[PDB]
Amino acid sequence: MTQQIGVIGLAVMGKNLAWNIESRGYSVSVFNRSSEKTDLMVEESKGKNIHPTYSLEEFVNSLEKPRKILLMVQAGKATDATIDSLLPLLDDGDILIDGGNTNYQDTIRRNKALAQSAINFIGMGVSGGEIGALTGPSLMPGGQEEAYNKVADILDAIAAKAKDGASCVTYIGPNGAGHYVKMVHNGIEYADMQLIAESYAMMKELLGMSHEDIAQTFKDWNAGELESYLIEITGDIFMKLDENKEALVEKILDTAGQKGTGKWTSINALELGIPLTIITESVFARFISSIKEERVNASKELNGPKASFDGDKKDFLEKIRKALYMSKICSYAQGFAQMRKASEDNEWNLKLGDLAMIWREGCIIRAQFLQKIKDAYDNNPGLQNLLLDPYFKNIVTEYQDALRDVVATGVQNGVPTPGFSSSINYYDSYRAADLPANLIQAQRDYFGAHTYERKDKEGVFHTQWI
Amino acid sequence: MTQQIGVIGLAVMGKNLAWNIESRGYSVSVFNRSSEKTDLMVEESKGKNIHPTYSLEEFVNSLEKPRKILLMVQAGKATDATIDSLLPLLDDGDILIDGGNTNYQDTIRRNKALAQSAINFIGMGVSGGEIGALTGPSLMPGGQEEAYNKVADILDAIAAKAKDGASCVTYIGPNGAGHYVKMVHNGIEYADMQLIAESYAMMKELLGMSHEDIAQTFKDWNAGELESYLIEITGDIFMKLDENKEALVEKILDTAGQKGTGKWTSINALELGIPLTIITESVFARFISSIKEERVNASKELNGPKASFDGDKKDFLEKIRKALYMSKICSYAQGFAQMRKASEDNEWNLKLGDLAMIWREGCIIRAQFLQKIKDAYDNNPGLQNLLLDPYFKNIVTEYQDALRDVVATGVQNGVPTPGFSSSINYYDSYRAADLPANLIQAQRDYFGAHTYERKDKEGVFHTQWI
């Protein structure tokens, strides 16, 4: 009567994961606190190997041991309440897998406490949306390694497969490493969408392009090095019409929503001392879009230059493309630098090459560009920055001219390019042997006696400047 | 016999603060747990009304009621340990004043906790460096409003006086509003130094100016609307020769740090939803300056254009000056927008005009500039953004052309200007009635079904995009 794995939380993503697991031949028990949605799953699953349960006691007793329970409830209170109600009914060695988009510190807290009751806790990031959950997502499980290996066959079977047959799931690391990697994935996704949107702003507001010339430009870009899911769906979005046969996306209110997780990536980067300029500017860009009424008011009081481009439009579209690809490199270089630092300060022993690997398919940021990130760390596991990898170093040293032209053209024409601007400023700061921070250091010694170091001598120095 | 006020912690700032208080004719008891710092201050206080004590029991018994105790100890656990060891020894109505660089959230915890035992707690931000604490600092006290009035005589006596006679101290607001305001002061200080540092880099790397010409430029700028303490000391710093008649500022290692306190301003901005791009990139600029040996390696593998200017240098110097002023306006507009939102969220009822008033002298960011921020809020207390203030409005719509030229030239010549770039981008985003966030919303609805709102029709919408 025992089933192989259990899922709690029968909304569309818990339901789609259970069906994915069932699609691969494993017997699944399901439970939803409100039993009426379990009653819809049984009807929507007639013929599959879905054993419904209608109490936490019948659910736990329906599962083989060590019990494998996938939590797909909403984050925060409902997750901790589900864990706490489950814990008395569990035995030593059982395994809980929180699959929500949980803040990684909650996972670290839940892993530590559950470990004192001999319960394994895996915080697993899940990316791919609801269609991806049903057919093959990218999974980022972190927690006890032994617990992971006891459920690794299920994870491997349901996860997306990259073009080399590799399943888009691997053991991330201890405790909160998986949910940390999922959060950084979303931060990268914020930047990828902002850079795409800056590209659209240039095309719409500087080159005066229509939605079909915009769509076709993105489809063209998706045929080369920039091939990504996000560029691919952007091309579809500029082809969708409304009732009046006008472009629908132009009818959408330009207030970017954000359910956190993007702001978490920058908050952590600031704590770690990691310059995450590009993802953070994309978070701030969402913030300022949400004060729509304030922007409408300032547009009637603050002057600016008219957007006027008189050069070659096709040749400048190619520059925007190069600028978009190089900004992606710098943003990923920042994002992967955050993950090495978080690996170091948490002793997670993150293998950054494995993270690019599991992001080649399934997730929202999936792109052929990620195969080149894996190739970088395969050729050099000690790679300190993606900008130094021979392939990426070759791209940025040539594309920087197109990026500089795009930024300077948008700045002079009043088109905001925050992701392009911080990209070229990151490249120029990271490659600068000497920075003006020496003036900052001398100022801090002037008004605070904070001392400074020298370039030619060694030791700590303090100057009476006046 | 009995003293009027007490200071715990006799490092240079608590020591200099105690001398300040005694200089105005008040009697002060002093305590340091490490008795050596108390003995050193005993000899240095020949002929002063400084009564040393060597136990917390003795310290509390040497002050008249209601007791006024100034905590100038290490932030964090050492502050909590002292508050804990003081609590049993105090009488209802006594006043603890924590004057360290403390996280405002700790102040909220301490204030709320000490109120249950009927003890007043003032978290007070102190700005001015070690010399400012001796002569006249800027004071940002928050806490019990009537407990402030009992110490207001002393704070007013020791604070710096603006040249209209007003002391740079005022009741900021309840609980942790004082430490919050000090924290935002520092973030603003970070942006002011970075923007001065970006001007320096432009003068040196793009215009090829010597330290003599760089010093003279800052002194001329200090003579106008940019009159500021940070610009004044910068002109001095570029005049300071080393032993071999060389500009000592150039010998200083260009590493600013990764563990400053300005990062807390950005973390709070990210949680409030306030776009703090200029201060945040000033924090990030310090991070990448900290990886010196990594930057030196990248400078040997990553190329860029060689900076070269071939136009009138004096005309461009003036454009740098306008770009610096405008960027300060944009930085402060964000910083003061952050505090307005925090005052609403924490129910502090902050009076931002009185805030700019007490920053006219004593603090590090002091400048003639802050009188215009005071004038902006006195003219319009409900002002939403300083960019809308008539005086600042007139400056930015005039100076934007110089800022755009500076940013564009800087980008085309490889000179990183993260502060200048995010300023013009912030000006172009805030004034844009329509932003490309509509594509972000469309994408989020494509892969995440997060729904969207429309510019034309009202309501919430979801679309099958393909």
Residue numbers in the entry:
A (entry chain A), B (entry chain B): 1 to 466
Provide the publication's sentences verbatim.
Two key enzymes, i.e., 6-phosphogluconolactonase (Pgl) and 6-phosphogluconate dehydrogenase (Gnd or 6PGDH), from oxPPP were identified as Ag+-binding proteins by LC-GE-ICP-MS.
Thus, we crystallized apo-6PGDH, which stands for the first crystal structure of 6PGDH from S. aureus, and then soaked the crystals into cryo-protectants containing 0.5 mM Ag+ for 2 h, allowing the protein to bind Ag+ in its packed form.
